[PDB]
Amino acid sequence: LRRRLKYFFMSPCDKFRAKGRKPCKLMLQVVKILVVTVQLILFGLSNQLAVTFREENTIAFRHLFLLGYSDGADDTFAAYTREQLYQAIFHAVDQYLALPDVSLGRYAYVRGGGDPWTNGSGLALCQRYYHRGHVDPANDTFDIDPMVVTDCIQVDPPERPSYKNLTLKFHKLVNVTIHFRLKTINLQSLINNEIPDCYTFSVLITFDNKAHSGRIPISLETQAHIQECKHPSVFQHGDNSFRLLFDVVVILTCSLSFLLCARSLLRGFLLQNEFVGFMWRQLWERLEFVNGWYILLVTSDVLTISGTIMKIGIEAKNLASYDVCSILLGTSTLLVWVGVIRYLTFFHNYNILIATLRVALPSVMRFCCCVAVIYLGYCFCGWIVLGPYHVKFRSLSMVSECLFSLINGDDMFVTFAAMQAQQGRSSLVWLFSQLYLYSFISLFIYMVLSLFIALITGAYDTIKH
Amino acid sequence: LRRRLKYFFMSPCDKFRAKGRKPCKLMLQVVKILVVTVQLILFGLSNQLAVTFREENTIAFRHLFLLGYSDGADDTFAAYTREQLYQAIFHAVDQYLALPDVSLGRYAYVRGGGDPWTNGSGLALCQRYYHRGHVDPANDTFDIDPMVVTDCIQVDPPERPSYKNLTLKFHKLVNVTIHFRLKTINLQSLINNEIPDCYTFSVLITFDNKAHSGRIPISLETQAHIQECKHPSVFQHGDNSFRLLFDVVVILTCSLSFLLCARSLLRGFLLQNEFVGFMWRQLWERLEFVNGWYILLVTSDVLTISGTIMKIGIEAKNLASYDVCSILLGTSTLLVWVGVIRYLTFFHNYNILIATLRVALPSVMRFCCCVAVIYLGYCFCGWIVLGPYHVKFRSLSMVSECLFSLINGDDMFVTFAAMQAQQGRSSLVWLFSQLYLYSFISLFIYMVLSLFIALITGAYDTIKH
Amino acid sequence: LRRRLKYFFMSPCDKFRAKGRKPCKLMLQVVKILVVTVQLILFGLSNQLAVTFREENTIAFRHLFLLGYSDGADDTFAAYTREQLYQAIFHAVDQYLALPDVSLGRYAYVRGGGDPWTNGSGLALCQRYYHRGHVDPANDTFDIDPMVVTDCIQVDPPERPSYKNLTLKFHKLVNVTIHFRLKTINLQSLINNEIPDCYTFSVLITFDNKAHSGRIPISLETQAHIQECKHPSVFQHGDNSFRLLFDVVVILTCSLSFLLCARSLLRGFLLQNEFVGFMWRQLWERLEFVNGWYILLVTSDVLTISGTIMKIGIEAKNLASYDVCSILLGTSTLLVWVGVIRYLTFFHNYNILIATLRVALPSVMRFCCCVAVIYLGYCFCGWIVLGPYHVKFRSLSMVSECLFSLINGDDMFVTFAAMQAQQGRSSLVWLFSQLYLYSFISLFIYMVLSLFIALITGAYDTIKH
Amino acid sequence: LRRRLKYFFMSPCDKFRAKGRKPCKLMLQVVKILVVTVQLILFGLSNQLAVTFREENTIAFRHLFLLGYSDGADDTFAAYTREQLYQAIFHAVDQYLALPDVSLGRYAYVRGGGDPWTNGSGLALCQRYYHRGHVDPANDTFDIDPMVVTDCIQVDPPERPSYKNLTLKFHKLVNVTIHFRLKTINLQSLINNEIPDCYTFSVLITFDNKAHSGRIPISLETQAHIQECKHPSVFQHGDNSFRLLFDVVVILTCSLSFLLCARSLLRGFLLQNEFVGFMWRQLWERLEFVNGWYILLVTSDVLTISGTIMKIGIEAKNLASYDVCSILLGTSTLLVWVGVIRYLTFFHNYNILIATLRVALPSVMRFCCCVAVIYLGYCFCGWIVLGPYHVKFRSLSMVSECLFSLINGDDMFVTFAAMQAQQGRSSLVWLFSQLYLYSFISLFIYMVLSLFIALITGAYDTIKH
Ligand SMILES: CN(C)S(=O)(=O)c1ccc(S(=O)(=O)Nc2cccc(Cl)c2N2CCCCC2)cc1
Ligand SMILES: CN(C)S(=O)(=O)c1ccc(S(=O)(=O)Nc2cccc(Cl)c2N2CCCCC2)cc1
Ligand SMILES: CN(C)S(=O)(=O)c1ccc(S(=O)(=O)Nc2cccc(Cl)c2N2CCCCC2)cc1
Numbered sequence A, B, C, D: 001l002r003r004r005l006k007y008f009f010m011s012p013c014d015k016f017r018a019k020g021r022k023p024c025k026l027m028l029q030v031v032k033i034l035v036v037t038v039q040l041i042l043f044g045l046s047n048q049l050a051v052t053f054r055e056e057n058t059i060a061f062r063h064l065f066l067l068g069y070s071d072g073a074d075d076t077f078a079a080y081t082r083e084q085l086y087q088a089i090f091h092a093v094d095q096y097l098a099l100p101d102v103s104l105g106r107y108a109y110v111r112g113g114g115d116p117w118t119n120g121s122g123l124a125l126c127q128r129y130y131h132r133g134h135v136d137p138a139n140d141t142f143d144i145d146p147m148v149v150t151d152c153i154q155v156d157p158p159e160r161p162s163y164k165n166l167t168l169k170f171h172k173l174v175n176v177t178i179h180f181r182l183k184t185i186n187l188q189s190l191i192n193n194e195i196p197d198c199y200t201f202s203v204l205i206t207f208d209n210k211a212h213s214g215r216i217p218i219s220l221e222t223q224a225h226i227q228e229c230k231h232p233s234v235f236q237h238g239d240n241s242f243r244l245l246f247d248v249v250v251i252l253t254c255s256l257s258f259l260l261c262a263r264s265l266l267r268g269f270l271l272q273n274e275f276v277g278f279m280w281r282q283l284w285e286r287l288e289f290v291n292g293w294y295i296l297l298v299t300s301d302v303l304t305i306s307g308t309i310m311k312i313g314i315e316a317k318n319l320a321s322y323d324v325c326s327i328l329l330g331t332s333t334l335l336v337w338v339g340v341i342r343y344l345t346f347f348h349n350y351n352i353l354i355a356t357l358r359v360a361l362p363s364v365m366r367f368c369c370c371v372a373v374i375y376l377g378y379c380f381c382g383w384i385v386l387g388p389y390h391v392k393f394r395s396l397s398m399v400s401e402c403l404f405s406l407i408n409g410d411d412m413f414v415t416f417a418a419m420q421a422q423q424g425r426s427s428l429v430w431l432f433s434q435l436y437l438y439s440f441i442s443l444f445i446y447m448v449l450s451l452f453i454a455l456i457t458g459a460y461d462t463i464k465h
């Protein structure tokens, strides 16, 4: 029983010395490191193809339909005169009508079946304005009914083998939007021997006048919908037997690993039950009886199996979720690579990181319990006060990123100098920004981070003795 | 009496064990954390609306009135020929006269009632020059009377249901300025259900020839003056009863918290007086009798109350001070979030930061007493010497920011390379910059910051034992 | 024998005290420091000339042959309409045909003798397309044979004392490439008194349609082939006797140093053999009998000799491998400068770095054995998942550089903000990027790097006592 | 005698306790801190005026005379066709001839009296080419005589109340340069009440064809020569009695401080002599008898006096050396501010920095003796090898700056990614750059800097006990 515990907690090498047992688990892990990473790279090929197709098509759409658009300046691209706005709208519609003989890609028109489009309509030109707006800055009066009324113009694609009478209602205009859909085939998914899928891009061009500030920003956004094409033909394409068989091999390897890990977990549970019965005959250690590396391994096994099933679906053309498949496979690869420290824990010369973390975690958790309220106060204050003026405080996640980078001494002078323009106008906000940044930087770089590192190194000093 | 001191210095949990007292103060603080942050976000909505309106209107004005202006290049935008200057001025005036049928926003003209404008004048075209200037570089002579004479041209807005004869006097010109005012309504303050305010933008276009260097920079600045509109009408607007009631709720919560904190402070003062009388019967500790977290809490309470009153005024349209209101509310939110460490001080496992700071503060103050004179010497020297040549040393605050960023290892190579242009011309200044930067960086990163962190970590080592 | 060991392990100064022996080895090293660095600089002159000629010629070719090309934007330079593509191609060919009377450099045409060019052809205009492509996005069908067929047009340079009928086959176009060669003489290799070499630039202009996304990027790449000119004449050029004699001097100095170092190594081997025989009469220390600074010195000697031979070949016009010669000479210079710490090892006040490294190396190796699997897991995951979306994760080496910079707190906010565009589209990938970056930064800056520095400083603390 | 030593080494406060002596030296230092800084700022005003005039005039000259010049792109501005070069040259000459009626500044022409200009010539148009050049890349031959022949065209300014026949000899052209001088008056030196000086700008426009690579960069450089104008007149200018009297006050304060410091030094020398005589009756401590703060104070006094004399000369219009005056005054201000630590040395609670440095200096010097050879090897290798390819390794000072910034973790990813272009072409150089950067960063950030900080903190630990 005590020798049973000895055997159960023995290292793999001394286990092999004891019973001449070849570490089948270790061999499975070693081959798992290679198979999971190879599968991740092979999937990454197709993921790159799909993302590249989407992004390059969006860039081509911007250059085709936005008048005067240049690379960069996706923001700071607006209309400032009525003639500029009219020219932008009419250029977008004209380029839509002239696509098939001016574009470098081959696109197909989608006749209306959806929300803005009527039957036969390919492009919907909608302007939205207040139901009743009497804006008169001269007499400081306005009688406004802020109910948005939508007025759409339907444009039919030319049939080859009205929209220019648009009055825009500038004083109460909310926004002008252009909706159309384009079908295209991802032919680049042919160097990878996968067959080309059929894509449908839903293009939305927005002329945003919600601020009513005399500046109307213009943006173009696309949504891509992948689906299989109808009875396609590729000359001597062949099969992807190798890809399918490798996916099956990865599935089987991860299944064997999962089964062995679950068997070891259940054996440890039975031994824990027997030992607690022994003690009763004669609750923070019975949990210590359990192996957390096996929890990590089973989590990684289920992640890899889910990712491989999703990838098989993607290659069989049913489920087009490249982001989900990539996230699953990448997380499983990371956990698989991390899980080899398990065989460095026994040596006591190689597990310095693991032992130091195990000792340092509670103190770090309490220190974080305090630093969290400090950090959240600073985040909320910075967000709300400096957000309208600072480009790095626009949203809460952006504020968190900026402050976390400042703690590590990144972009400090840029953060300071993004308010030199406000030094002259809103000098009070500029002075508040100075005090806020100086206080946060001093307190967190010099007082808090020092104590964090001190806790970690003190735990290391405890471990090494 | 000693048990009275025991009770007075007991933690909240042991206080509840002692007298079964529910920590009403703690409950008030907990709900205060939520109410103050929610109020800060709700105010931030309107603050964002106002700041966005101002900035976007200024950008639209720049693009409308500055000839050849593009986004970016707010600096490095100048005239270099007489024809360029004349075209810029005439384009600005022509765009002013053509606004109502070319701009995307709706603006109203303001007839003259102020400093540069006469009765009926909307735009004032003023050039300023020396009273008598005879500049003759050929004979190296000049008879100059440097009294600035102002010559203004008044332009009346077109009345719909002379300025081109401007001689500019280039050889003694000081500056040319264009003044006009525009009224507009912030209609975007309607998605927030607040009613639109009436704004008046005072636009100033400056053609600055003060350097007399053949380059005349052009800039546009605006001042926005918010006021309520006259008898406006919004169809089914409703009230902001919820906003007003939540402001009242925040006020009442902060008032209760302030009253409890002041009661505890006065009780502690009475106990201190009683104890000192006891000692006299039988001055750095009687102050220690006092709670600094209650000082922080009362400061936060008064800040929150002032901010809420100002916000109520803003929503009632009387006081338009968004920067002051935002600064008050953000500072109060930061202090409110910081004030929960007060309940982590008792545990002795969570107040590592507070104890380390309490021990480390005096040594840090003395070390700063020395490093302050070192830092100020470096700041003044850098400012005056490298200011004309370095873009990051233009002003004293900018020098302080640059040096503080250099201490944290930020923008080091950019700071070094901003003088590669001066390596060839003013090689002496380039060499001085090299020595200055190397010396400052070495001395402060390696000698001073190391001792600062050493003081803080030594105080931590004192605390943890 | 023991006094023999004393003499063999004595420092140079005490050796001179013992036998009055002038350290000829030390003198050779001292003069070697100067000769190797001077030779490296002298070679760097010619290396700079050659690299400058190549790069400036490539820039001139880009500006000459790429229509609408501006400095910068080597990427983000593409065609988006059929007319743009045709104009770019025809402009490239027209500039090729008009070079000799429009270019600022003097170039010669190379009639065809190679792969794309026929006899007499100077420029080859090749378009590549699928052998059979029936792309029809309207019916979601395609009958494709993905065998690339090449169609080349041959252009003959004008003879001074057809290509415009190009149909491009857009729907199945793979790429369009322009191949031509230009000969020129590097006249700038005359201020260095070396004679001008004759260069042949092979220019390749690519119009890449492999993505079939409606955007065709355009790039220009050149390959330079250096060779000696036929019977050139420079008036009173003179010889490079000084350069050749200095190369011979460097060779002789390094040869003497190599001979002395090998003699000392063989003497140490003989002494080790004698001592081990002594012990046998009476395996990790017999290797310690050996001097690793002499291994470093012989490696540096052979590197310097190889580099000098290659440099002599370069100046004698036979072997044009400037990159190989520069790498050899620079590595030898670095090792030569490093090799003077050998005379600081004896003092025990100056070899703190060497002793600390000697003590700290094994623990660092084991810690790296663990951190390597952690780092590789993170690298693979980041590469495959964030590569399509993040500009700093495009390739595996780029991922390694990005993560290594993040460990040192560089470009943190830029890395975080390169996904704000994906926050809206692919919010799942944006959230994964947030978690990935936060986890990696925390774990490696705060836990791993702290323990690395702790190991190094603990080894130092061991040494200093 | 021993009480004499007690008095001589007593602190100022205990000296005042001893003999009731008011610290006149301390009072002089305190007023010196203010007077020197005020003088530095007052001089910085005029220094800023002069530097601003020079730089803005150079910018105006660039925009006036360089065809197609835009802000930025001072580099990457070149000609690539013969027509571009001719148009640039002719535009420069035409703008020179049309200055007085197109420029915004008032300039005067300088008829020839110097090197390139003949009598009456204002502009010299010189082209330089090889004396005999027969460049023939077709036959791989050239008969060249590399003696530069200069051919200048003289242009006379128009007389108001030939250069277009320029043949450029492209195949053997070395460079084309345009020389002319312009006189102007710095009128901005009138808001400071200093009178305007007369400036003479020597403009040099270079068309550099030294590389013979088909790309000819174009640059403009100016040299400014300040001198007093002839009998100028400013209406009611007044005197600068205040400035002169304040300069005299600074001179007198620094003179009194210097006299007291030298008296104390000589008294200490006499006491040292007496003590050594005492010891002889009964050499590293007799130097310790001396005060280094008095050496620093006398250095600062002589620097301030020299700077004030130079500033008086500048304001009296004799010596125009603003860079020298600024460097002297700024260095003196820095030393003056540093010299107050002298009164914090006695307290033993405020001189932690000084004591730590005094203890740590020798070990730091030896560690630097080793790290210096390591750093120099890396600097030379990086310079010569990566210089032609990396933008941050172009010169030796730039290499030193880049490596020093890398040690502090600055611009790491930018330094890594400046070779992604060379990954494809010169992959060997790219791989060498990878190895070089990784090795340098690891060795210096993790091994060397750690031991440097360890030495400094160990000296602090010695001091604090
Ligand atoms: C950055 N330093 C180590 S710090 O200055 O000492 C510090 C700052 C902020 C907190 S936190 O409680 O607010 N949590 C938090 C918030 C944002 C980003 C992150 Cl990664 C964190 N983590 C810190 C590491 C453990 C996991 C949580 C704690 C310490
Ligand atoms: C940056 N390091 C910790 S440092 O190199 O050791 C150091 C530098 C400068 C001084 S200072 O006396 O001049 N004060 C000062 C000046 C500018 C910005 C700031 Cl935040 C400060 N504060 C330092 C932290 C406490 C509050 C004051 C002291 C230490
Ligand atoms: C950066 N820190 C010191 S670290 O966070 O503690 C750390 C990170 C990564 C590893 S590694 O095992 O993966 N090796 C590795 C991978 C990429 C670049 C480099 Cl230079 C290395 N070297 C680290 C220094 C010794 C030589 C190898 C180890 C420590």
Ligand SMILES: CN(C)S(=O)(=O)c1ccc(S(=O)(=O)Nc2cccc(Cl)c2N2CCCCC2)cc1
Pocket (backbone or CB within 6 Å): B438, B439, B442, B446, D367, D368, D369, D370, D371, D372, D373, D375, D376, D404, D407, D444, D445, D448, D449, D450, D452
């Ligand atoms: C940067 N760290 C502290 S370091 O990695 O430990 C280190 C790097 C380089 C040397 S050096 O001997 O080559 N001298 C040197 C060369 C360039 C710039 C500078 Cl500021 C220096 N100084 C270092 C501080 C004292 C004065 C000299 C020494 C230490």
